[PDB]
Amino acid sequence: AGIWSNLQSVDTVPPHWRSIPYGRPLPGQAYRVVDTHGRDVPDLVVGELWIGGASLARGYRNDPELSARRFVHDAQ
Amino acid sequence: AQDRDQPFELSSVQQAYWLGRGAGEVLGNVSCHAFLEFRTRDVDPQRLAAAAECVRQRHPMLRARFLDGRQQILPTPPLSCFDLQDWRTLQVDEAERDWQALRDWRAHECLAVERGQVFLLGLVRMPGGEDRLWLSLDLLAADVESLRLLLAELGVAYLAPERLAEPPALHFADYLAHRAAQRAEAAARARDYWLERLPRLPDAPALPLACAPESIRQPRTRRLAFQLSAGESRRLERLAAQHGVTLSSVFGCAFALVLARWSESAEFLLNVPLFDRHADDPRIGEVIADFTTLLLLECRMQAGVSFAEAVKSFQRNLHGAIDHAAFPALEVLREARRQGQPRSAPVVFASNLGEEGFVPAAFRDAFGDLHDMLSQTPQVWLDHQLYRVGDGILLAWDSVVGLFPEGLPETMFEAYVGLLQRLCDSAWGQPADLPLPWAQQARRALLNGQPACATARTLHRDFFLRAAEAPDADALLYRDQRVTRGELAERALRIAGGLREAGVRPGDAVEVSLPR
Amino acid sequence: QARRALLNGQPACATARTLHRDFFLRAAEAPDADALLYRDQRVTRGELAERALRIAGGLREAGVRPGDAVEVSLPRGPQQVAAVFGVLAAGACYVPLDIDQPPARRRLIEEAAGVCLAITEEDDPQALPPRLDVQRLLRGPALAAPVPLAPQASAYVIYTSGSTGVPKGVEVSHAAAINTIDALLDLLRVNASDRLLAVSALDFDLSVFDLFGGLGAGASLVLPAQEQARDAAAWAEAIQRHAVSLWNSAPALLEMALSLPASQADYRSLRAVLLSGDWVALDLPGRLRPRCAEGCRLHVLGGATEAGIWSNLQSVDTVPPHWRSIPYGRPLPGQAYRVVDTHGRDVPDLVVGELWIGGASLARGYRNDPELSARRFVHDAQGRWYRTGDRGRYWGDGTLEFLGRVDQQVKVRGQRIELGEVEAALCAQAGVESACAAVLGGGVASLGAVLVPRLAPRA
């Protein structure tokens, strides 16, 4: 993501947190939570986190192949 | 004779829900009863009282006592079979609010099966001239198809006890002494298949939880309900036939797609009750007893396939695991626990989709079609059932309150209904893939939409301007010494010139290996 | 994509409910209040509610039941309104086939809608849909309240034109209709002082706003009669007499209304205006601003029936000069626009592509054509989309310019024709009021075009 993709401000902790969550995705960037098939999973449904948008690093430098596994492209 | 009055063993799945009364059992502490609420206008409580205790005296299974993991039948139980609440005496809104107290209690109730009370009819006669004829049946006594047999017998016993055709004589214990031992070769022959798969069976459907399933002392079931129209039903049925698949396979496939989409895993166990009739007596479709066997359907729900593929696939998986169902889901999950792997199917797909109407015609005529219902199935987070209602279809999701996040089974069901009529209203060569519930995806498009505040520039551009603006301003402080912006900038630009001198040029890479 | 996700992401205004609910609330709240105004007589919410529920109990007596479906083929008036509310309050889905429509087109739909009853002036149980008199249905028992429906069930099947050869039934759920309506009610603040004008034929879904928008807000649906189906003078009288505040139409019908001089046709009661379903001429707000009330508030709205009554709103106070059509504005709350290429990938801004409409306003599909529904509706990682075949493009501010259709924007023995630029350039002739163009039959497959003069009325 470069340095980050979220800002959960924490003025105070509400009692329903079980960990401090990733907040709203930062300006210019985004998250999806996704199935093994990459289709986005519903709210509260646990899935893999994908980061997107204008904060993404390019890839793993001299490794293009891990970059094609760990970075993916969708209509989104 | 495993004689009609002797104590006899619980049939497989009867053990499962019997143990589901255990207060420490996983999401236990509850009956496994269906509660039905009908509405009708004005119906004789004396006919109803007489009908309830008629069908108890006609059908030994409705007067079965349950103790010690076995069933022993009371010739007549100590406890009354009809809860008449003749509230034509009350005012209407008091009767409604007090009906809510009775409703919640009776519909969540652990029925007194130790005292022969598997079956409990009742009636609140609401002073609005509405007889809320209702029916708590512990499914310990009966298969849900056998619950529509109870309704068939009750409808006749209310209308005309003269028309009650026969005492259906094959005793349920004699059927178990038959059918369980008859299937026992197929139980072992399937136990092989299951045993050899116990590591390779999927998990429980990994839906989201606001309480883990052992960690609530009473699963208060909440029903969620949708009557698919007669026309939506027709479109599902035409498409079901056009794809060569049973309507139950369609609703099952669709449910498995929803559950998949809401699970952490697209592969999981869900339980299917099979309302078995393979004993040779034609009255086995007439005895009011728990002929269910429970099937552990290991469904596996790919993305990207059309729904037509996903349902043909789900049907093969259902029809194939039906062969293996002669070893019961109960004993498979015990076998997984004996292998030290705590698998379960804590979600159920009960497709009561015989063609006649779920409430049989006699009972529909006597009172009304089903108005509301609840299933108190233990160890089950989400008891999804289906019922023909009119020539339409009721989709029931008997969720558990508080187990799920609040609004989740509502949302996940509104997405299930949306899918099932996306299956009415668009041909199944469409992707099996659901939409998200749009309100969720719209929220997420806002989150992901937040504008790039990026004044997009090379990463140093600010600093070399901040340096030109205030060269003396402090940029770095160290153990005592400090570097001004101008100093850091001039130092960095000397290094930069040193790097062009060293043959480094833009976008080529430079290790930096310096103490802080 | 960030900008477009913000727009498509705007959340639902949906009080997600059975489409008819709020009228039955407004009726239980004020039975005395004006539901409708008509030829001379007026109808109160109490009258309409009981009339509709008598029709509904007549319909359950006629075996119509949750999400079974009913042709509605009546003269415009309180009998038509009470009929659709009575179908909806039977929990059934209404199939409006406005009686001006020829029996030829109707007969295609009589089977294709799966339409198991018809409402008409007429009892004829031997008709293909067994056919029922609205008045004998009004002699039915009242359902004391509307039949219960969850909102995802079918609400109406508006039928697309006979231009298709075999008509298609756009089956819209209550959820889809009411998301659209709510999402617009909140922008219009529709209230007890409001009075809509149903210049809408019933087989066109602006009527679905006129109905459940107006009457759900308790605002009064002013009715032209059937013999007033294009009578702009009766509409002008109706606006002036029954004090219409919320005009709603295809723009040709407001051009029909504005054809009448202000002295003859006082529109100064119009508090806000909804325009839809065909191209707004850019100048139309420019013409309308003096004719309607102060705070004129034109809204131009977009999208097919397959995305409810509309899917967009552009507010207009005045035209910013660079508009070449009045754009679809933002997508409406709870529903979205992708612009796609032919290959279903989203196009970048200012690139023309097909418009895909998404989210909480979509139709169920086609009433008995699941097979064509799978072409005209699609499913992606981004969920469900109605494929409009309209052509359009985003702008840098996310405004969605409208640019005709996949039909019309076609090749003719060579280069792609912008027939909207043929219209615009013929409208750039002085003395033209409107212009139009097409591509023709025969082996030559020729282009064709059409002019219309402006007359400038005088004494």
Added chain:
Amino acid sequence: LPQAMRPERLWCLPSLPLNGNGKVDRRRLAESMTRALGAEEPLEAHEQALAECWEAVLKRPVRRREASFFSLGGDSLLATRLLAGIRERFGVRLGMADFYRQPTLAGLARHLQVQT
């Protein structure tokens, strides 16, 4: 924490190790615990009493204080025969709430000790 989320072996530190890029060093932690890894008869009267009960339920040799009811014959039906046998053996109100969080014979012996 239920059974599969027990730390089935456990460890502790004065302070957790930190990875180069500032994290808790879950790499080093997992691998240290990994290197720090590298049944017996009934002795207690409660272990013998459980072996009398469990064996009479299971029909198979409970020669072991580390016997596990789950792997021996874990069924909740058989837990009723066990519950009845121990309810007779000590007059205690045993149930699955107590038993299935403590499902090995030496773990369950602790419940017989408290006579409740």
